[PDB]
């Protein structure tokens, strides 16, 4: 839980001033004002949509979700209103496969990649009982969303250091890319789909493109293979005084 990249080599996460404004009885929040407001809305538009580059006649259909956001200052309700939009399903649901839609919900709303096939198949268990709105509100009303983001900050890609699986850090680095990278470049076709269902890992050059500036992006590759052989049984011996002991 130290995480040597997070507030050192990246920026600080954006969001509202505090969460004590909800208990204030003459206001609802520290009132930001329309220069301090819309530059936070620029960071929700760059995160829920990727870099989708939404036009002026596509933002006009999102007029109602901002007008509620500048009165009720909850960030989580703004993210929930933008994921049930037409502009979220015409980019990430309409021409994609099912695990491509699921792997972008982990990117846009959690900042991580899915850790399992069992965690991934339970999101298709919620598709059968309520469609795509049952997937979206179960991510938003989860415990993992509450104890990382809450109502206060935008859901950002967080370098944690103490990931519950090491593979979770790998699939986060494939999902986000560089800053000149959107998420329409594959023709559908989930990137993490082979590695979730089989149990293997990712490619080292695809992860090191998305690492920050100043973190040895790519070195360490020996010129032999990049993954491990599960069938190999090596002999690793320890020197004692007399000989060499192969505690296998």
């Amino acid at each position: 839980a130290f995480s040597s990249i997070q507030n050192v080599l990246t920026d600080a996460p954006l969001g509202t001033p505090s969460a004590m404004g909800f208990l204030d009885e003459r206001t609802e929040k520290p009132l930001m004002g329309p220069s301090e407001m819309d530059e936070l809305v620029y960071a929700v538009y760059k995160q829920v949509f990727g870099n989708a580059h939404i036009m002026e006649s596509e933002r006009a259909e999102l007029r109602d979700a901002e007008s509620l956001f500048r009165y009720l200052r909850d960030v989580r309700e703004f993210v929930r209103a933008l994921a049930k939009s037409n502009a979220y399903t015409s980019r990430f649901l309409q021409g994609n496969q099912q695990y491509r839609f699921f792997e972008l919900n982990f990117k846009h709303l959690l900042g991580r990649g899915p850790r399992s096939l069992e965690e991934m198949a339970s999101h298709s268990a919620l598709y059968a009982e309520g469609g795509f709105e049952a997937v979206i509100d179960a991510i938003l009303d989860s415990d993992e969303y509450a104890q990382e983001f809450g109502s206060t900050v935008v859901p950002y890609c967080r370098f944690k250091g103490e990931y519950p699986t090491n593979e979770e850090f790998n699939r986060m680095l494939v999902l986000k890319g560089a800053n000149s990278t959107s998420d329409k470049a594959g023709k559908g076709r989930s990137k993490l789909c082979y590695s979730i269902a089989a149990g293997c890992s990712q490619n080292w050059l695809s992860m090191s493109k998305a690492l920050p500036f100043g973190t040895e992006k790519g070195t360490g590759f020996n010129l032999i293979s990049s993954s491990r052989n599960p069938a190999a049984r090596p002999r690793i011996g320890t020197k004692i005084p007399g000989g060499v002991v192969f505690s296998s």
């Binding site: 996460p13 969001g15 505090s18 969460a19 004590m20 909800f22 909850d74 989580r76 309700e77 509450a146 104890q147 990382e148 983001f149 809450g150 109502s151 206060t152 900050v153």
Partner: peptide
């Protein structure tokens, strides 16, 4: 920046339950 003693939609509830 999350400040653990905090909620999101029971905060919606009790302002429309103390009036009730």
């Amino acid at each position: 920046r999350r400040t653990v003693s905090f909620n999101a939609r029971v905060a919606r509830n009790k302002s429309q339950a103390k009036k009730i």
